[PDB]
Design a protein around this ligand. Structure first.
Ligand SMILES: CC(=O)N[C@@H]1[C@@H](O[C@H]2O[C@H](CO)[C@H](O[C@H]3O[C@H](CO[C@@H]4O[C@@H](C)[C@H](O)[C@@H](O)[C@H]4O)[C@@H](O)[C@H](O)[C@H]3O)[C@H](O[C@@H]3O[C@H](CO)[C@@H](O)[C@H](O)[C@H]3NC(C)=O)[C@H]2O)[C@H](O)[C@@H](CO[C@H]2O[C@H](CO)[C@@H](O)[C@H](O)[C@H]2O)O[C@H]1O
Ligand SMILES: CC(=O)N[C@@H]1[C@@H](O[C@H]2O[C@H](CO)[C@H](O[C@H]3O[C@H](CO[C@@H]4O[C@@H](C)[C@H](O)[C@@H](O)[C@H]4O)[C@@H](O)[C@H](O)[C@H]3O)[C@H](O[C@@H]3O[C@H](CO)[C@@H](O)[C@H](O)[C@H]3NC(C)=O)[C@H]2O)[C@H](O)[C@@H](CO[C@H]2O[C@H](CO)[C@@H](O)[C@H](O)[C@H]2O)O[C@H]1O
Ligand SMILES: CC(=O)N[C@@H]1[C@@H](O[C@H]2O[C@H](CO)[C@H](O[C@H]3O[C@H](CO[C@@H]4O[C@@H](C)[C@H](O)[C@@H](O)[C@H]4O)[C@@H](O)[C@H](O)[C@H]3O)[C@H](O[C@@H]3O[C@H](CO)[C@@H](O)[C@H](O)[C@H]3NC(C)=O)[C@H]2O)[C@H](O)[C@@H](CO[C@H]2O[C@H](CO)[C@@H](O)[C@H](O)[C@H]2O)O[C@H]1O
Ligand code: NA
Ligand code: NA
Ligand code: NA
Ligand code: NA
Ligand code: NA
Ligand code: NA
Ligand code: NA
Ligand code: NA
Ligand code: NA
Ligand code: NA
Ligand code: NA
Ligand code: NA
Lengths: 597, 597, 597
């Protein structure tokens, strides 16, 4: 009768054990010690309790769910998905996750240690799915929370390579739901056509959710795929750190973004991106303001490495009928980003920062301010016409650039004949270094092309570090752009031979509170008088000039033009030079024109 | 007789096992394999060896200690604190940790994998405690070391919500002691009223101690609590990375600091703080110099996100009778910090950097230098009068600010009628961007309020990015502040309408080695002479001016004032203008006054 | 007969188990559950299957290899190296790793959890070795890959303290080989004389290899050791993060480097270094271009803390007969670095950045560009003559410095009579702060010593923050250095008493596209005329000057020199001053000389 017990499933519960023969240790049974761990093998069995080998013809979903449900009932634990095996999923889950096209329901305090591989079976080909779902209701607004759920290990989630069947479908790897202290660490997500790999939170509900040391490889593969963002961070106090993102499909270059940060106190740091269209969206959607309020603040994008084809960071905020989204207190620092090799205009417009209009294309709903962009490097190959430090395409209430290195076609850009952004508090510090890769490519183009409705309380301190005589101007304001309470300067270095430096097509530099300086060539003529003698400009376009000074040597012995000039009411410049010998003098001089500076 | 063996505690030691039926594998017994792991269950038993269920009426302390002591005796290992259970602690420990109000003694090479919850029982209500202590003696100076002790997992240390019983009491979570290669990873510390959560090292003794991916939630809850700093780093080559700190109590806004760094080669990176008074102290206490010397150098505070109510980083050093503390080689970079919503003066003075007097209030003991503050963003709401980029309240031997974005009431501040710091090597680079949130709030106030005993070898390059005509001045030096061998400039942008820009109440700008430029309005009158004609200032307050130039347009046709001016011995300005027609001229002009620049 | 089965090695395979008595769980045997884990104990046995205790007289190599080989055959898993034991290695491995002096062969998907200690036995004294090798062939070009191999834990690899027997020998800890998704985490490598601790990849072959939270302690100890670099990163999309490196040997101060990055998309972040010669090499060796191409781009060195004796980051690229290496798109940011206490010239030349000639000493093979060095702090003690922000010793095609704090002897340096680098696109922004530690030490020395063949498209904006009248000049160009299309400025602050500020020994500032300004003292004399009167320089060395302005006060009542000056064809300066009373005037004035700026 003892033999029967020992060979029964209660057998281990009759074999005694004491840790290391320590007489001070608990007198236990072997089953107690084995019960301290749990794996999928403990649930991957047929109705008679016989273990089933996983494989492409076995659907492991019900067994994994049984494991999760059971461990949940004991207050949690960690289930191991064993190494050396591929565990296939081949059906949809039931109940609360069915509304989410869910496969597996995650549960609070039940962690998954994925050491083996989880593969999607062809049941999912051309269909929607979300592999792991933390919602417990079809309607997220009526869902309970997921808490203390961690997925980690050296294993792999493989989406089977299946294309989307229709653009309207959604696909996800891990949707944590209304998620508090949940995380994914170490996992490789690969070989799919999905909308997201991981979503965190739901419309501001959730906290302390993180993606760390994960890899995401080849997760877009078709023209059907409407849009892809690898990680969507939709709860506060959450972020993505030390991850690796790679795409190889041409479609990903037009549709894929690595991360989005959609709630306050979120971050994206220390990650490497290759083959994506975009780096990160940093936005406040009014529609997503329920859980954590209508402000996305304390947003951090730092120390990432990227090769992308479109825009690195996209800023935005928008409104609904009853809620207004605001984006403020953002830092973008220490990133090194390039636009990968491509033809001009062959992917979305290349940019380090984009101020993006809302999903309906509106440029007059945004409330974006207190952004710092500092200590980044950006590069686009010389052929890429559509490359800018910032594409400023919607209303901006402030963005500050200090000590970056931007090596691309444009510094500030917006297309003419499109949006007319209202710009406030745009600061471009003199410590921004403008690279020379695009020198000689800029025929017909303005380095800072200020195609806006208006600019106020802004600073543009242009500093070249090499010549580019191809450009039409360093900075141009069309007559349609109002300019007030602003500082616009062009340093003279490398500008001696430029026909135009700063261009104000509406004469906007004459504004009462516009502070400007830039180089210009000026023709002057003197009076005949021997001795101290006035020189006057021939042209009368300098009524706005407070002072000017020589940027040219004086090749003459018998006279010298003035070193410095002021203006007169008729718009001439005037200064006092010296005629060692008398005579009317005529000179053409390069001057630094100054207004209130 | 076999049956009896099998059911005995030696039973598992008689059941044979060979790994995966591999004939090349060791012929072992089941007990050998089970002996490869160890958990609290192996020691959580009564004197007859019967397992005891944990719970609020069970004190688990002796069992956990027995586990640690035993594993220590075998050269170490990792003890699991099982998931799905709350393990309560309800008594003090004995021996060497009793002097520290210790509960559990940590031991070298014995790691704790906390997957479940550790809770303090109400025995500890109103009492001191340190939950885990690595010292082995009541007197730390006679304590051995703790080495290779790691605490990690998804579990929780809960301090039971109990208030301090008296302000003089101390409470701690983990005190590693004289600690070498010790760490805490993943753990949540919550629900208390404590002095610290984690301390590392002891007075410079220790090395390579780290806190990573931990959460600290609601660890101050009473008015009795004297002071709280979540992590106190008191050994070199140690730090805090990727942690989350949150407080909700009003008291924490006045008393709580997230981290202190007190020894060389220490760091605080990539963390998020909410609801605290302070971010980090970075200090060298002479009293703590025994283990690692009297210099705190290589101190790093980077890439943190914070909402705080007082000061973000506090710098300091101090002395004892025989030892002098020095703080140097510090970097504060990439942080994004705001003062949270509060009334002016309702918490300690808001600051990004504070130069803090010693614990006795002395401002003349410090030796702080070679600090770099770069690429940070700081914001305080417009109502918060008590907000500064730096509150400079004690002697400073150097601090360098480059390429930050500071959006608060003051840039440099110290209160008048308090300390008179001696300031050396304060560098404020022109690349620091001054935000506009507090525009129009600054009536009676100086943006840079230089309330110091003296300033030497310093640079203040003031650059506005919007108008604020409410401020009394951009920078003011009271007559009591000596100023020498320094550069002080105010860029003209947004200053045209300011009555005062730079103010030197002791005429300190006249110093031999003071280099200054700022805008001013000057009245001039010319001689009557037709032709080249001198203009002279009516006032005689410009004996210090080396050159000046026009910041105003000339509304006249018949004459022009000089574009540039020098001075005369009587303190008038003088320049040569031009009278097309003769006559005495009188003008009021905005000039850039320059001295040696 | 049952008893015999139970005591046999198949015994555990006859004892039934069901998880937690769950009737829905798999009916398993105890051996199935034990088979879910594996340790070295399962293979550390004699030929009769009896377990062998590890120790200094036991060679564990064959047993560890048997474990790896076996687990490999089942598609992988994790082998534990148990805590509380030291496992000695005392022989070389056989087959494919013998060509690499290999001890253990790593295999794909077979992870090692090192909790105990692995020690080298004295068999290896004075011999070469590589402890863990991922190559499967003696010739790497014919080797298969290593994939999904992770080494982690709290354990230790100890190299036994043995010195190298000959300089030509190689020693390594982990050579992952042609390595894809491999990593080392948590491990301490200590007590050796080795070439490397860890190498990643092979000549560009490999991907996603990482070293995280590892310690490296005392890995150089002899004069025989030819060269040491702790981690050599030789595959793309790979890096080193949050590690600790320490050396105590004098030899390490001359030969040891913490990291090298040799392929694209690699990083070195968040680490602490003490006692090393060098921080990191960042290079493209043409010889290593097979796997990932001939460009090292997207290279990141950030947020490290270092005390070193030579150079922090060394940049380079080189060629073979058929391949040319290129280095571009590099960011060095947020690092805090000092040269440790040492005598001048007692270790390799101290530098933050070094542009290093190739291994044959050639300075004309490099293609280095698009480098950003920003937001770092560097310090060298005042006695260390051989300390520079950059030692620019080979051809440079671009490097940009913004918003750093450099406190050392030289800013830009190269030795005269050595290499004559061709320099292009060197940008030194005005936001770089120059510390004062070396003030008064610079007799005979130029702060920026431009000992190059030529300089083009470069910017040097010199800004002092304290006086140093000991220096010969702020910046000097020898006559042998061509200078064109460049901007060179010296801010006047702290320069009033300097005899020389900028020195152009070949009069190179006269170039058509050279833009310069610096202070100078100039003697002038006026004509006798009462009224507006010309002042002329006595010297004729200013044919290149476009304008000049006064940096001196005018101590006179009866006259004033000109505020501003231009030049004449004979090289005199000329300006119009004012004689209230007539008379020839003679003055010596400090002027800001300007050319095209
Ligand atoms: C793929 C992606 O992230 N694209 C973003 C875009 O996001 C929006 O489009 C999406 C397209 O997939 C998502 O849209 C769909 O999914 C919604 C959510 O699904 C339901 O709810 C979930 C919880 C459930 O499991 C499902 O079963 C569904 O029931 C659908 O409602 C919708 O019909 C789909 O088209 C995305 O929705 C969000 O998804 C996240 C993550 O799952 C959820 O947490 C949110 O609840 C949900 N949000 C809402 C409002 O429903 C859509 O948000 C972003 O809009 C843009 C951001 O950029 C654009 O706007 C900014 C700000 O104005 C501008 O600056 C830019 O210029 C402009 O382009 O970026 C895309 O990459
Ligand atoms: C809470 C906190 O960290 N506050 C710091 C403040 O720290 C000092 O006050 C503390 C208040 O709790 C600690 O003080 C007490 O604890 C001491 C240590 O306890 C004994 O020793 C330990 C090892 C043992 O386990 C215990 O059982 C006790 O026997 C007591 O001696 C003392 O009486 C208590 O009030 C703190 O002490 C240090 O604690 C750490 C961590 O445990 C130990 O490693 C150190 O050994 C110990 N140090 C000493 C000298 O004993 C006190 O240091 C800081 O002083 C300030 C820093 O800021 C201030 O100074 C700087 C520099 O001049 C200025 O710039 C600032 O302006 C100024 O405010 O910050 C507080 O937040
Ligand atoms: C120690 C170190 O890293 N020093 C670097 C230096 O590296 C070069 O010298 C090395 C000295 O140890 C290595 O040289 C030897 O090892 C080679 C590789 O060994 C064979 O192949 C391996 C795979 C196998 O396991 C072994 O059994 C051997 O069969 C030997 O071929 C050679 O004879 C030895 O001297 C190093 O080699 C590389 O090693 C890595 C890591 O193992 C491998 O992945 C590479 O395949 C291998 N590379 C090659 C080409 O074989 C040598 O590269 C660096 O050269 C310098 C960099 O700095 C210098 O150059 C730059 C760029 O021009 C300049 O800017 C600098 O100014 C200049 O100093 O730095 C040293 O610290
Ligand atoms: Na749905
Ligand atoms: Na997207
Ligand atoms: Na979008
Ligand atoms: Na308009
Ligand atoms: Na005590
Ligand atoms: Na405190
Ligand atoms: Na304090
Ligand atoms: Na004084
Ligand atoms: Na070899
Ligand atoms: Na080396
Ligand atoms: Na070398
Ligand atoms: Na030359």
């Amino acid at each position: 009768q003892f033999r029967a017990i020992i060979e029964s499933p209660e057998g281990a519960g009759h074999v005694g054990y004491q840790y290391r023969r320590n007489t001070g240790s608990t007198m236990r049974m072997v089953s107690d010690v084995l019960d301290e761990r749990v794996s999928l093998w403990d649930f991957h069995c047929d109705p008679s309790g016989n273990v089933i080998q996983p494989g492409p013809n076995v659907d492991s979903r019900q067994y994994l769910q049984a494991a999760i449900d059971y461990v949940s009932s004991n207050g949690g634990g960690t289930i191991t998905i064993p190494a050396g095996y591929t565990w296939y999923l081949g059906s949809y889950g039931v109940g609360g996750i069915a509304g989410h096209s869910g496969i597996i329901q995650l549960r609070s305090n039940v962690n998954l240690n994925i050491e083996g591989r989880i593969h999607l079976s062809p049941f999912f080909d051309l269909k929607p799915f979300q592999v792991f779902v933390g919602f417990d209701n079809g309607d997220p607004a009526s869902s309970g929370n997921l808490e203390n759920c961690h997925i980690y290990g050296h294993g792999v989630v493989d989406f089977g390579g299946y294309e989307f069947g229709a653009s309207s479908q959604l696909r996800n790897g891990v949707a944590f739901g209304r998620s508090y202290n949940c995380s994914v660490t170490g996992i490789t997500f690969q070989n799919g056509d999905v909308t997201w790999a991981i979503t965190l939170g739901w419309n501001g509900y959730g906290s302390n959710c993180y993606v760390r040391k994960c890899r995401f490889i080849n997760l877009v593969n078709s023209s059907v795929n409407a849009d892809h963002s690898t990680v969507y961070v939709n709860c506060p106090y959450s972020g993505v750190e030390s991850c690796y993102f790679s795409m190889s499909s041409s479609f990903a270059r037009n549709i894929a973004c690595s991360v989005e940060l959609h709630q306050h106190d979120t971050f994206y740091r220390g990650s490497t991106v290759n083959g994506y269209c975009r780096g990160a969206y940093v936005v406040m959607h009014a529609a997503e303001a329920a859980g954590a309020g209508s402000y996305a603040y304390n947003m951090q994008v730092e120390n990432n490495i990227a090769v992308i084809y479109g825009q690195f960071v996209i800023l935005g905020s928008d409104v609904t009928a009853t809620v207004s989204g605001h984006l403020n207190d953002v830092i973008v620092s220490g990133n090194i980003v390039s636009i990968g090799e491509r033809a001009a205009f062959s992917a979305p417009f290349g940019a380090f920062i984009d101020i993006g209009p809302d999903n309906s294309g509106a440029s007059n709903v945004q409330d974006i301010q207190r952004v710092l962009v500092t200590g980044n490097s950006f590069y686009a190959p010389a052929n890429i016409t559509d490359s800018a430090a910032i594409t400023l395409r919607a209303n901006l209430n402030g963005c500050t650039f200090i000590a970056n290195n931007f090596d691309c076609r444009y510094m500030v850009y917006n297309a003419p004949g499109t949006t007319s952004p209202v710009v406030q508090n745009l600061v471009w510090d003199k410590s921004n270094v403008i690279g020379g890769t695009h020198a000689n490519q800029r025929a017909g183009q303005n380095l800072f092309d200020m195609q806006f409705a208006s600019v106020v309380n802004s600073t543009i301190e242009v500093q070249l570090s090499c010549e580019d005589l191809s450009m039409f101007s360093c900075i141009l304001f069309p007559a349609s752009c109002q300019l007030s309470y602003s500082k616009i300067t062009v340093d003279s270095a490398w500008t001696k031979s430029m026909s135009n430096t700063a261009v104000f097509e509406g004469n906007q530099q004459a504004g009462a509170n516009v502070y400007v300086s830039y180089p210009a060539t000026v023709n002057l003529t003197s009076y005949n008088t021997q001795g101290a003698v006035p020189f006057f400009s021939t042209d009368t376009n300098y009524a706005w000039v407070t002072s000017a000074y020589s940027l040219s040597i004086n090749e003459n012995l018998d006279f010298s033009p003035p070193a410095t000039y002021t203006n007169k009411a008729n718009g001439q410049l005037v200064g006092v030079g010296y005629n060692e010998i008398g005579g009317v003098r005529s000179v053409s001089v390069r001057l630094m024109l100054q207004r209130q500076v």
